[PDB]
Amino acid sequence: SNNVKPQVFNPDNVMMHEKKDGTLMNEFTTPILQEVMENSKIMQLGKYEPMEGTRAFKLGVILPVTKEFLNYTYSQFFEEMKPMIAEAFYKKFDEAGILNQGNNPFGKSIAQSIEKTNKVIKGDFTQDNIIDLEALLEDDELEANAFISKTQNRSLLRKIVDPETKERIYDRNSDSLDGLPVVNLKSSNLKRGELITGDFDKLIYGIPQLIEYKIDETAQLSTVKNEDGTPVNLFEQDMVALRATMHVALHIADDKAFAKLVPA
Amino acid sequence: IRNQDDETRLYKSDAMSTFIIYDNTVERNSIAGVRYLRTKPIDKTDEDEVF
Amino acid sequence: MLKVNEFETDTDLRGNINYLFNDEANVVYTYDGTESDLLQNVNEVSKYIEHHMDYQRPRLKVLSDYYEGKTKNLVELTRRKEEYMADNRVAHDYASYISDFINGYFLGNPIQYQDDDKDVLEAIEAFNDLNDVESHNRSLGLDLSIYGKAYELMIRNQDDETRLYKSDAMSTFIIYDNTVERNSIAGVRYLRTKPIDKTDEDEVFTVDLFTSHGVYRYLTNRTNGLKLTPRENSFESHSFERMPITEFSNNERRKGDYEKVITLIDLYDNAESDTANYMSDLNDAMLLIKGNLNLDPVEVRKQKEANVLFLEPTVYVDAEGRETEGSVDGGYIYKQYDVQGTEAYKDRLNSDIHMFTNTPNMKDDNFSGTQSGEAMKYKLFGLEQRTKTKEGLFTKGLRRRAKLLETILKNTRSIDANKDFNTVRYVYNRNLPKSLIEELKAYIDSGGKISQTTLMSLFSFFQDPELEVKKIEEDEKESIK
Amino acid sequence: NINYLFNDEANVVYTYDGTESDLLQNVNEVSKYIEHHMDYQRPRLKVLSDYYEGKTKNLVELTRRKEEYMADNRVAHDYASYISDFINGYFLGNPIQYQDDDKDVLEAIEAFNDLNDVESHNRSLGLDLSIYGKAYELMIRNQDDETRLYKSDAMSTFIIYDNTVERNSIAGVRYLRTKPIDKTDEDEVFTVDLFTSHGVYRYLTNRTNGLKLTPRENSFESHSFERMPITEFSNNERRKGDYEKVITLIDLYDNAESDTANYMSDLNDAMLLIKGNLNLDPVEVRKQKEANVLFLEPTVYVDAEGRETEGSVDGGYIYKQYDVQGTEAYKDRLNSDIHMFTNTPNMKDDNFSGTQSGEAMKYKLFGLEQRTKTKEGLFTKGLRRRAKLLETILKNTRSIDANKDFNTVRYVYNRNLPKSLIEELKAYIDSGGKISQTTLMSLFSFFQDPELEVKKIEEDEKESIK
Secondary structure: OOOOOOOOEEOOOOEOOEOOOOOEOOOOOOOOOOOOOOOOHHHHHOEEOOOOOOOEEEEEEEEEEEHHHHHHOOOOHHHHHHHHHHHHHHHHHHHHHHHOOOOOOOOOOHHHHHHHHOOEEEOOOOHHHHHHHHHHHHOOOOOOOEEEEOHHHHHHHOOOEEOOOOEEOEEOOOOEEOOEEEEEOOOOOOOOOOEEEEOHHHEEEEEEEEEEEEEEOOOEEEEEEEOOOOEEEOOOOOEEEEEEEEEEEEEEOOOOOEEEEEOO | OEOOOOOEOOOOOOHHHEEEEEOOOOOOOEEEEEEOOOOOOOOOOOOOOOO | OOHHHHHHHOOOOOOOOOOOOOOOOOOOOEEOOOHHHHHOOOHHHHHHHHHHHHHHHHHHHHHHHHHOOOOHHHHOHHHOOOOOOOOOOOOOOHHHHHHHHHHHHHHOOOOEEEOOOHHHHHHHHHHHHHHOHHHHHHHHHHHHHHOOEEEEEEEEOOOOOEEEEEEOHHHEEEEEEOOOOOOEEEEEEEEEEOOOOOOOOOOEEEEEEEOOOEEEEEEEEOOOOOOOEEEEEEEEEOOOOOOOOEEEEOOOOOOOOOOOOHHHHHHHHHHHHHHHHHHHHOOOEEEEEEOOOOOOOOHHHHHHOOOOOOOOOOEEEOOOOOEEEOOOEEEEEEOOOOHHHHHHHHHHHHHHHHHOOOOOOHHHOOOOOOOHHHHHHHHOHHHHHHHHHHHHHHHHHHHHHHHHHHHHHHHOOOOOOOOOOOOOEEEOOOOOOOOHHHHHHHHHOOOOOOOHHHHHHHOOOOOOOOHHHHHHHHHHHHOOO | OHHHHOOOOOOOOEEEOOOHHHHHOOOHHHHHHHHHHHHHHHHHHHHHHHHHOOOOHHHHOHHHOOOOOOOOOOOOOOHHHHHHHHHHHHHHOOOOEEEOOOHHHHHHHHHHHHHHOHHHHHHHHHHHHHHHOEEEEEEEEOOOOOEEEEEEOHHHEEEEEEOOOOOOEEEEEEEEEOOOOOOOOOOOEEEEEEEOOOEEEEEEEEHHHOOOOEEEEEEEEEOOOOOOOOEEEEOOOOOOOOOHHHHHHHHHHHHHHHHHHHHHHHOOOEEEEEEOOOOOOOOHHHHHHOOOEEEOOOOEEEOOOOOEEEOOOEEEEEEOOOOHHHHHHHHHHHHHHHHHHOOOOOHHHOOOOOOOHHHHHHHHOHHHHHHHHHHHHHHHHHHHHHHHHHHHHHHHOOOOOOOOOOOOOEEEOOOOOOOOHHHHHHHHHOOOOOOOHHHHHHHOOOOOOOOHHHHHHHHHHHHOOO
């Protein structure tokens, strides 16, 4: 269009070739991945359940892009963004199922299971506190399968040594504690001093619909207002948007199968 | 390769996924060859490019 | 600036001097002393290596880049424009076209060997088969076409075999005796090792010095001033009695087959990228509308589909009541360039590039009836004149290769010390196209004879060239009954 | 160029009035000749060589060139090399053959030729004849006790002749600049070797002292010939080169082509010209490549009494042009004249009829043949001297009977015209020729094993008897 001021959008989620200060991102260098892309932890730990139809809930997101940006800045954007959306879905699902965070739609979660059974250990990381944490599971005939931890506490785990065998209980190379694998959560909600464990075979999940992507050049984005408050029309404003959706289902077969260690 | 059915088989190896590391001497004997392939499902583009 | 201290500022202009026609490149190195006088003062070899890096290598490197098609026009990005237009830089690969044609004409057909003694002939043939000398000869003849010179190294392998390997022209040279005979005193090869993931902070070079009695191995850096330090197990004896490296020359001057037309290749690159710029940057045509008017940019979008264009001039009213009309106008305009002059110029460049290299100008070409073998011989007459000299120098090199081979065979007593290898006759055939049917008719007329199985092997309509003989015996046998 | 190629002192023949003794006792005279050679003859030879290497005047005469923002676009066309290689290959691309009535002399000649690779030597001399107009060869009895033949560079060799009408060669000299590689070694030391009919004298000299010849340690070295060992060959009676007389046309072609390359580099191919009083936004001008309508609205001027009038707007493409007709006709004339004056086939204006390329070629090269036949006479005149030297050394070593005579050798020349083995075979076997089966097979390359085939024929021809 002939507008020489860039379009202000509310919310400002539209990708643009030109910044608010007038900078065209011409000649633009290809972005590169400063971090490893994160993979779903409950999809790693939990037990898959073949499921037909939906309890399930629907995850989804829409990424609008100005066609000037899709032309003159980063042409490949929508191919390079699909994994980043898959990351975002993994993180949303993990945070809902594990921590009961992010307005999880299910009435089920590990945090709620632990908060219901009160299976929590107050204390700092010590060999005796790790053993007590595991014994809270083995009390009810269930054996720990893995650990969930904030990666920032490996500094605490390296300081623990078995005083009989006189060796590190934590293998920093294997990233396994007491012979059990430790998975790391990048989310900000699990605090430094918090550690979770359980028999994750008691946690069941299903995926009725894999991540489906649809690119559209014509729809109306009711949720994104132009500066004047009119809804964004993709075709008429010369805009493109990518829709991604997935269906996920979560089940906890035995809510006593999970225990948590927390700072005193 | 000598196949499992015990037959000598010859197969082309794609150039985009194969290369050879040669001896540094003027004779350039081939020291070792490598092949590497991206495992993928048909649709769900992997977030890790696992080779 | 004062040119007096552009050096101290380090403004002193970097990236200038012409490499191909410099006086220091292409010189032949000589030494006044004996091999011993040189070898005891290894620093001298350091001087020669340094000179080679500072002058000869750049020339060979430019010649190689043109053979690879990395012509100046692709790399000299310094004055290009790409703020909104396309770059449209171009390279035409005349160097590859020329050098493959000329080398295929020379060595596309293997060199044959004749001798009066079958023991020598079979020792030669055995060595040639072991070393795949046919392909080797072709690859020398191509280094002769690119760099104007080529090198080959002969070594007795660990498995106790005589091996022949080409040595890279950018990394090899020879130091000659100062006498009029110019025997080769010593040869050197030097290669840059580098890590694959990095550039070394220094540049590290491995240096091999070949004498008439052995190989010396050393290490050096560009940043150490090339101080030769012996490598572990520096010396290695070799059983020849003369320096193993041999040098072949394209001609007396050791000049490459397109080295003298690179400026025309450059001019052709510039001309064609110029036309590609004109095409990219100017609009083919536009509808010009003049005069004071109201154009709705919404209406202009109909320009593709309107039939009638109506221009109504503004009427100007004078304060005293007069009326007068503005001058409206409309018409198409289109870009144009001097096609005659630019095509005549580019055609002259192409014609001269082929003329000065005796290569057939495919654009101005006609086929003389049907007889390819004689028709080409007319066109390639000029190229034959140069090739015959190259053939003389090439045989001069092969004679040394044979001298070395006889020496090692005698020192291993793999042949009688009585033999002489200089009697071998090297027979050259050009790669001109041949007509097997016309040659069969010329050979069987005039009294030739051919065995049935061979004759059948010449014609590809026989699906089973041997079984057919049995089938003929069956027919001819039952014909007796 | 002109002042070096056509000067009166260059290209002259040196003569001395005294005997060899009169010169050798007064070695300073050799210094005079050496200075004259360096001052006058060597510049000419250098220039001819530079043109053979393609370093024509246009590449080095930067003195009047421009490079403040344009490219240099200097050019060199290499006509000298194309010409000399063509002419030399035509003359000596096919080896000289030797005939004699006495086989002892014939085999001594052929042995010497084989040892010295005389085929290549002859070709290299023919090339020097083509570029410089003269060539020199040196024959020496080597340390390994063999008679060796080596070419001597023209830029560093010359001969002083007897002043009588016979012009016997009195003495030859070779002077060479020793230089190392690391330093542009600032002093002008030459090693000067003077060849007489009885030995070689070695000296050192430098320019600063007027080329005073000072004997080198172990100055003298005897040689067993009985006449001065260096021989001189001439391209023609004036000893002029083949392209020497067309260098000025080669220069004109370089200048013309670099002129057009400048016109191409420096001017814009075409531009959109817009005239008249207007507002052009330099941001809007960038749509120029993708706009369809160009709308020009003229400025309206208002008079103080209220009149109104329009400015004259205008627009249209303009493009550079040059006199293609005249420049191409001129460059075509230069090229044609170079080929005419060098009797070299003008490839740009050429056609071929039928199939007998070799029989038709003698027409186009008829003009070249006339010069080559003279060159052939002078060349044989030189080879006879080479033989005289060889017979002398062989007799003084008693490697041959003193009874033999070498002037009976007949030198047979063949031109390097293309040939057609199928026509020649048909012409040789018609008219009664005979060929052995193995030879006949050796002529045709479809036989993969020309000798095994004979056994394979015997098997068939044997079973045909039953």
